[PDB]
Write a protein that binds this ligand. Structure first.
Ligand SMILES: CC(C)(COP(=O)(O)OP(=O)(O)OC[C@H]1O[C@@H](n2cnc3c(N)ncnc32)[C@H](OP(=O)(O)O)[C@@H]1OP(=O)(O)O)[C@@H](O)C(=O)NCCC(=O)NCCS
Ligand SMILES: CC(=O)SCCNC(=O)CCNC(=O)[C@H](O)C(C)(C)COP(=O)(O)OP(=O)(O)OC[C@H]1O[C@@H](n2cnc3c(N)ncnc32)[C@H](O)[C@@H]1OP(=O)(O)O
Ligand SMILES: CC(=O)SCCNC(=O)CCNC(=O)[C@H](O)C(C)(C)COP(=O)(O)OP(=O)(O)OC[C@H]1O[C@@H](n2cnc3c(N)ncnc32)[C@H](O)[C@@H]1OP(=O)(O)O
Ligand SMILES: CC(=O)SCCNC(=O)CCNC(=O)[C@H](O)C(C)(C)COP(=O)(O)OP(=O)(O)OC[C@H]1O[C@@H](n2cnc3c(N)ncnc32)[C@H](O)[C@@H]1OP(=O)(O)O
Lengths: 386, 386, 386, 392
């Protein structure tokens, strides 16, 4: 009796009721902000639901992201707000919903999907697997304050600097061949920079955005193309040390700040994980950046009953930072993988780990080494939660 | 009045006084145990001190480790127990000690050195830089118990099994081309396993060692070549769930366990950093494993006033998993590095980060891509603190 | 110059001032809800105060409850919001107030009165004694989620279902001969179920009402006539285990959930006590339910200077589930009790403890067995605080 | 484990196997301090010599172990011999393979052979014990009071003296008198010898009046009452005031006692809202003998059939008639076949412990039979809520 639907504006009240019984209550002001954001999802076909009769019983949204992979931007479906009414849980409703979400993401031409799961079981069944991390580290403000770079011009930034921020990030991630980071629309970055609770500063070759977190400061993002600039931006955040003793920062464990500060980040850190799924393997491969110098001619046997279109035997050809995935008619021993193994592989997870987890099977070890290096590079991470 | 010396047995009581005023007091039992372990260092010339008159004023010891790098074992001088008497601190005594340590380390043919620093400043001045991590993750015991694997034969292990453990771990790290991990003497492993407080279990293709940690269980090390065995070993630890709610484990963030367990490790994790220094760059390179398929022909200009023998221009040649560093007399623009950047590079830290931290300067961007992939591979980590 | 009055609607602002200086400030929002509730009390003659000249100096409210005793509903005056202006405390004003409250509740035809005391001294002087408990137990949501009962129809409930909730509760408490539980007017039950912060669910023979409690779930009440329904309703609460780790529940220590769940409730529990007083002993006895099979013919000598109409020598006759308290002409040795011992005995507190507390004196031990079993039965408890 | 080579069998643990049991225990509960091991071995030998220490071996390696305390347990104011199961441990690589169940079946059999009609334990996990027929039967409560409040309870006129080992038999008399008068249920009866050990321990502070006693000790800066027994108001006040006299140093007194304890009626400030509530489980091993030894509620009368389904103890299984009158009960075979209350071991144990029939039916532990039987059984097994002061 259940039906998958496109959520409309007039159903948002019912979606909010299912939400209140899933995540918790919304404050009266936060509810108005939620509805405002829900509208753009509705009118772009990125708000799916399940109805029982005329009752909305489950819902999920799809962010129109791009995600960095090996220094290139790949269209990505970010799944958010997955909720099911308590009395409709444990009956296949969430799965029905998510299958509809996957189909909608494919139709919109998004070759990959990511999410932060509250429970892993349902998403693993649908073929998602952990693909990367989000790290929060804690530093002493007084240490950051003293980093110097006082000669660098740093000015307060605002909504009007959105395009410049995008440019700066793009240059950085392309040079480092970064993986995992989200690309937001210029419009959402403008909102971000316009929020008066966010403190943003811009230098010629870097920027920082930070805010208050319970008496301490929290860095949402710092980007810097040179040492003097990194120092000046960290020093700007740390300049509040007379009040904030601690600054937490979302960044990679490979961030240069660890090499710059005197006092090591606190041993206690936050490490969260996000999941990835491939929806259109050839398009995802064609869009991914590959490791400089890496060459590979490898066959892959994909078994994905969730997305039958990418099932079957493929040939993976990688050269000069580019890869292509084409149908193969060969017969030798071949690496066999399901949706989970495929996602984890694309995300750069070591074949050794994937074999031990049982996500990948068969194939010569010679293939393993070439795949490892091909998908290798910086560890995927994200700065944002969604 | 200040002299570097080799610490003797009769001086151990004075080293313990300095230690007491540096790290804190030792229980009457750990006292006797400390002396036992110290004697081996004394006799192998791996216990250095500084005297003022006839008084021991500073001391440090050197572990004769090996360390895995790209799947090969590299001899490594592990520095421990660096202490200076309070009234002698801040006067260069610690630095004099450490230069004697680096010198002794070189004489014993160890091409690299690592340590966990309480303060970064003295070691950075000496040329060390952060090279890798030690991660502790926390899981729910009941969730590990549910992994199953009970069909897999598993027996209690003892000191007699030390050689077998070494075989299993060697096979694992060579397959994954691991970096960072310590190699302990078989004698040290036998002791580890003899200890009644350590619970060691052995399968055909894996092992686990764990113990109690304040009411929780703590996994020191788990090695497993197959899924069934990984399940069996983790489930053996988790079988104590009726008493211990939580299992903490030292392992990599790429460990297959994250792919197997239902509930994600606690967001709250321990992340520690250890530092590295190259003492003999040509030998360290020649001993390192390199990424499969990686090729590179690049010049490097090393400026290391701490070890002038490795200073000057070099040619790095990497092919087929092996690298060689030879003297170069070429001119023109070249990647320039101090000891800190050199260690970080060797450890796999990306050049983009090194450049932003100011640890590396000059040279074409072409070289950076070559270097990154050459030194690429799994992120370096350690299971042990010392 | 101190005068007891009936609180009028225009004195409510004065009451709130007293309350602010007694319990703490009210949010401007919550203040409006307090007025809304206070109006009903004023009109029905259930809001008393003490004035000093013009200004209100003290106030207290009387809820028009019924309370289950031995499976029957007894009219009960629930005392709430007892407050005295700080500079008027310790001068007998609170006791003047409460004698007014006791006077008023009897006049309204209420045989018993109950309250949660912030201090025991004043209420003990007025003749109240502890009669029962309110328990909170903490369970693992994952455990509740898996209880099953999937076959049982469970639907979302609302204000409209208020009458059916009353019916189900009525059937349960009569079958168990429950004691201590409050009976709310169908009006307040409606508001309860209207409140969007409360999540209510109905089955053919059971229901549950729960809500968020700081990231955990809290069950206000769960009633189930059958195993299948008990499982289904607990599973409905537990279905949120992906977000809520813990489910707190107000229930009896005899609740069947303890017999169903795999993991025992946390050792750490909440145990609060509420107090009871008899206002009209013969009517209280006449309305109480008595243990099946129990028969007793025993005299009581009551000394209650707070309610002199109850005082004197009485004869308790108990047979076939009902009891009767009659004036007695007999002369010899007899159990003597004051108001505190009387209330405690009514509540089912065993004679042995009453004697050791000194709340009851004299009489033969043959009488004690007669009394114990007469007033014996399930331990009295409440789900609600007031 | 290694099923190919394992040869698992139940044994009686010997004195020379204690070191091996200690290995299994360390990997189960945690390491023992040096001084605590000494006290464990000495205690273990007693169990070994009385045939109350069972284990499982594989070949000649000890793989599991459990011991049986020779307790008595109060039920409705009478003492019932009871097998208290403790230290249940299985080596990690042998868990989840039926070893603990094989051990515990041997434990139940040894307990029956020794004439104990009931058994109790504090379970770390309920699953294995419910499969074997145990169910929750009662509680252990810890409440916390303000010491300064206890200190002013009075009773200065009551003679209170320091007690020691030689007062063990007097303590048992006082406890006995109290529990018979209140028809108490759940409480442990320890051997006089074990009580003497308790009172000779310098860390325990014991005081004795003419009609009561108290034993208490330090608990991390606060005081903890292990047990207080008092027959009269004056004595209760005096003994609580003895404990509370420590208030200048200890702000808080924790106490193990029933929620029905008179102290709640005596003290000004009520116990902290935050309390400890632990549960222990019960199983009947010989139901007729358990019923015969139980005290039953004064005035209670009941004639009711029970259909017992206990394949764990076949001798208990079948249809029985329960006769209760004048405080005494008897269970005899019935040849009737009409509608009857049906229960397994879990429901039987819970019913014996006084759990309400309504709860047992909702929990599914009890099925069928007329509603009229429910009321009779409820009052028969009714009385004070079972509790225990001790953990084991
Ligand atoms: C003694 C004990 C707890 C059980 O002995 P054992 O030889 O492991 O027991 P075994 O006879 O093999 O199985 C009987 C049943 O019990 C279940 N089950 C067992 N354990 C747990 C659990 N943790 N959590 C949940 N359930 C558990 C088993 O489930 P499965 O593993 O088969 O799915 C069996 O149920 P079934 O599958 O038929 O539904 C042992 O594991 C131990 O020493 N633990 C640590 C020390 C300790 O706590 N000591 C003090 C204790 S006071
Ligand atoms: S991100 C998710 C955020 N949503 C929330 O956590 C809010 C609370 N939870 C919910 O709203 C729902 O339970 C959701 C989102 C998990 C939807 O899932 P449901 O409709 O209950 O899942 P569905 O019935 O399709 O189950 C799919 C699988 O997930 C499993 N599953 C669902 N919830 C859980 C849970 N809390 N824990 C473990 N497994 C779970 C089911 O058992 C099933 O697996 P199985 O076939 O191996 O048993
Ligand atoms: S791993 C280290 C474990 N040892 C301890 O931490 C025990 C306590 N401390 C000590 O024993 C000593 O101070 C040591 C070992 C940390 C350093 O030895 P010292 O003799 O004090 O070092 P030395 O005088 O050679 O100084 C070398 C540099 O380190 C710096 N330094 C030393 N200790 C500290 C500190 N606690 N914080 C910041 N900087 C420090 C010195 O200022 C100097 O740098 P500068 O030239 O830029 O000023
Ligand atoms: S439920 C009560 C909720 N209200 C509050 O607690 C708010 C703050 N307090 C108050 O409003 C008042 O003090 C009340 C309602 C607690 C008491 O009213 P008062 O007018 O102070 O009490 P009154 O003067 O009638 O005294 C009656 C007895 O209670 C005692 N008493 C009153 N407050 C306390 C207290 N906080 N602690 C101990 N005893 C107290 C008095 O000493 C007196 O007993 P005594 O004859 O043994 O001395």
């Amino acid at each position: 009796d259940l039906r998958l639907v496109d959520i409309t504006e007039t159903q948002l009240d019912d979606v909010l009721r299912v939400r209140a019984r899933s995540f918790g209550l919304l404050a009266a002001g936060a509810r108005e902000d939620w509805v405002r954001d829900a509208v753009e999802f509705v009118h772009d076909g990125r708000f799916l639901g399940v109805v029982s009769g005329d009752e909305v019983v489950a819902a999920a949204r799809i962010w129109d992201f791009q995600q960095w992979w090996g220094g290139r931007r790949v269209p990505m479906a970010g799944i958010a707000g997955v909720v099911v009414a308590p009395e409709y849980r444990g009956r296949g409703v969430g799965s029905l919903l998510m299958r509809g979400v996957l189909e909608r993401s494919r139709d919109k031409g998004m070759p990959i999907s990511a999410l932060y799961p509250a429970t892993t079981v349902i998403y693993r069944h649908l073929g998602y697997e952990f693909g990367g991390h989000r790290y929060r580290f804690s530093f002493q403000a007084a240490d950051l304050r003293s980093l110097g770079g006082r000669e660098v011009a740093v000015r307060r930034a605002g909504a009007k600097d959105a395009a410049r921020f995008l440019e700066l990030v793009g240059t950085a991630h392309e040079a480092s061949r970064a993986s995992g980071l989200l690309v937001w629309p210029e419009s959402k970055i403008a909102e971000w920079l316009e929020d008066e609770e966010n403190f943003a500063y811009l230098a010629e070759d870097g920027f920082v955005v930070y805010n208050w977190s319970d008496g301490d400061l929290q860095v949402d993002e710092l980007v810097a193309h040179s040492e003097a600039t990194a120092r000046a931006l960290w020093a700007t955040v740390g300049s509040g040390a007379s009040i904030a003793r601690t600054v937490h920062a979302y960044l990679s464990p490979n961030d240069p700040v660890h090499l710059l500060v005197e006092h090591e980040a606190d041993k206690q850190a936050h490490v969260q994980r996000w999941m990835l799924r491939l929806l259109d393997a050839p398009a995802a491969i064609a869009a991914r950046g590959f490791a400089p110098g890496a060459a590979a001619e490898v066959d892959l046997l994909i078994d994905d009953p969730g997305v039958p279109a990418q099932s079957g035997r493929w040939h993976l050809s990688v050269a000069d930072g580019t890869g292509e995935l084409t149908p193969s008619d060969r017969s030798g021993d071949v690496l066999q993988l399901g949706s989970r193994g495929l996602a984890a592989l694309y995300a750069g997870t070591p074949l050794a780990a994937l074999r031990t987890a049982g996500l990948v099977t068969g194939g010569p070890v010679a293939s393993d080494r070439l795949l490892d290096t091909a998908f290798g590079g910086a560890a995927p991470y994200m700065l944002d939660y969604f």
